[PDB]
Amino acid sequence: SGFRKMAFPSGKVEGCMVQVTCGTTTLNGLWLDDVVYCPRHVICTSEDMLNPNYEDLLIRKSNHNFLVQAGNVQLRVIGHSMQNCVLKLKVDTANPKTPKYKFVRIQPGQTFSVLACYNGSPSGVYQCAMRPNFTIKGSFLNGSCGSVGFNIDYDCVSFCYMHHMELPTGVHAGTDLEGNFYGPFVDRQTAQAAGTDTTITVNVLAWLYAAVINGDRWFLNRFTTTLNDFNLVAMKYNYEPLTQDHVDILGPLSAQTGIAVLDMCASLKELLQNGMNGRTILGSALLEDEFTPFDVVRQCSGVTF
Amino acid sequence: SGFRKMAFPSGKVEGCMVQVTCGTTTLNGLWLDDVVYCPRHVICTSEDMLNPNYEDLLIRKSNHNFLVQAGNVQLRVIGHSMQNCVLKLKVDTANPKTPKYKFVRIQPGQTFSVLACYNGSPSGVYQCAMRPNFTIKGSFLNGSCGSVGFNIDYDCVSFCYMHHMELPTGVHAGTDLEGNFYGPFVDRQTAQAAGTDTTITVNVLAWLYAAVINGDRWFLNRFTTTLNDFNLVAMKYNYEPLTQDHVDILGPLSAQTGIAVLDMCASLKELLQNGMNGRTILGSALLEDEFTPFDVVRQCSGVTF
Numbered sequence A, B: 001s002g003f004r005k006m007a008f009p010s011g012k013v014e015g016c017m018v019q020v021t022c023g024t025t026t027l028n029g030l031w032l033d034d035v036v037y038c039p040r041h042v043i044c045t046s047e048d049m050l051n052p053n054y055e056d057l058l059i060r061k062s063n064h065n066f067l068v069q070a071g072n073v074q075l076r077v078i079g080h081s082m083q084n085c086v087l088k089l090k091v092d093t094a095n096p097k098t099p100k101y102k103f104v105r106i107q108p109g110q111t112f113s114v115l116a117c118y119n120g121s122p123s124g125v126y127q128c129a130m131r132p133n134f135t136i137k138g139s140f141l142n143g144s145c146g147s148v149g150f151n152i153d154y155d156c157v158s159f160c161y162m163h164h165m166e167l168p169t170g171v172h173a174g175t176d177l178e179g180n181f182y183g184p185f186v187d188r189q190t191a192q193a194a195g196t197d198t199t200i201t202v203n204v205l206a207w208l209y210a211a212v213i214n215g216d217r218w219f220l221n222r223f224t225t226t227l228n229d230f231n232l233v234a235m236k237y238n239y240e241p242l243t244q245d246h247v248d249i250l251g252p253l254s255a256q257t258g259i260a261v262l263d264m265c266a267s268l269k270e271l272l273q274n275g276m277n278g279r280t281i282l283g284s285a286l287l288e289d290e291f292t293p294f295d296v297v298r299q300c301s302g303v304t305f
């Protein structure tokens, strides 16, 4: 019993974190095989960030301008190149701790664990979701750039996020490990803002199934709804549309609890229109949307890595 | 910016998790140096659990009755002893991955990370707090016994909890790493129940200071309170008494934000009286009590917004 915001075990990623220093800027790098990946803005001064020409800034740097420290050992940079918003520093030593890995680009609504790092040293691990507005509500301070997001499926770490910046509302923006930003953001000190966010409907439904599995049923009702009527209500409350794909993905949870997906949708509609009436669900007074259907099944079944 | 329920990176603990088997029972063990620590109830059958005589059950065992598996390698047990409710299995191999560590017994209100494991394999990591009634609201399924709670301030792992059982309300009971249970619980299947749980007042205050540091002040008021009047009100909402020790511990946060501890107590009193009126504090519609003053200082910026 119990239901917690659970992150993947971070050990496989901790063994990849390094410190990358270029001039006065120090941030984190991810060392996989003989390459260290880090945000390309490590080469910028605060002045350069106003309007940077990364190719022009990079051509002025030699391999020795990049100081890479893995624990208490300095790695020697033997090559450097840029791929989108990520700098790839070729080093002479392959990371002996390199896990089985892949670079995967995730979609809004998908969750992942973030290993927050400072000076190449892991500080904490937390679970978060890629918001529909492509930001993450992370917890990062100065020096956290280059910290990564990941999932684990079997024994393979799927790296999906690299931290680049904090937006004025305190939310965070970054890229996949190929340097493509999530969302309409750029790596430049210029006016940028997160768009209006919405709630990840399929995830709220998954969390309602988790509450039922954990013995919280007060919100269940005898009613059902159509996908179109539910989607009209979801649009009204700034909830993402629920698709037939989402309904299909919730199938196993629906079969285990005996509550049809559209039956859980009628429960959600009632919660949206009436609130919780002083009650909580899994210790929350808000509808939680940062657990996917897969996260719920994994946590309620004890999958290991 | 941002404020998340953040766990310590689990890598140092993942490298210590092993599987312990005694007959038909399999659970987790913590392998540090040449000793594997695990719940003593691994030697019990479900029948033995009403009134087990652990001394009598253990005397019938030899070293070869304990099967310890570290990854895909069987460790050889060369000695066994019981210390309170933990079994210590001496093995013929020191764990090469043993981190710098200590065994620390924590007090209610203290937080820690839990690395949930099944069959000696880590499944997830989450943040927990030792409740005032000495239980933890974990997320644990059958097979999770032997999973541990820890803190990693610096490069030293302070092990503070070992999971032993789930109580009828779905909450969890365990011991420190010397085998002493937290709370009035026993490793017996006799009827046992958690005492009435209360809110960890000092932690709610710490979290209100975290909200002020991150830029939110809507909940502040022009009032102060005496410590005794605060406690008289707070006890009516099932909040733990706030002691002068708690007021002293909140000193640094009070100095950083400029809000006196008793001035924050007045805000808390008003929040208990009024509720949030549709507002949230750090993304929560409830008053959060699983962040300590130390957690807030570690996570938050040293510069208030």
Ligand SMILES: O=C(Cc1ccc(F)cc1)Nc1cncc2ccccc12
Pocket (backbone or CB within 6 Å): A041, A049, A140, A141, A142, A143, A144, A145, A164, A165, A166, A167, A172, A186, A187, A188, A189, A190, B001
């Ligand atoms: O945002 C930047 C620097 C930066 C990057 C790209 C860019 F376009 C402009 C500035 N770093 C930070 C990242 N995360 C949390 C932070 C908290 C506080 C301060 C800085 C943080």
Ligand SMILES: O=C(Cc1ccc(F)cc1)Nc1cncc2ccccc12
Pocket (backbone or CB within 6 Å): A001, B041, B049, B140, B141, B142, B143, B144, B145, B164, B165, B166, B167, B186, B187, B188, B189
């Ligand atoms: O509680 C026990 C076994 C046990 C130990 C000591 C004792 F005296 C009685 C029973 N195991 C479990 C631990 N945690 C979560 C669990 C969820 C579901 C089922 C079993 C769980």
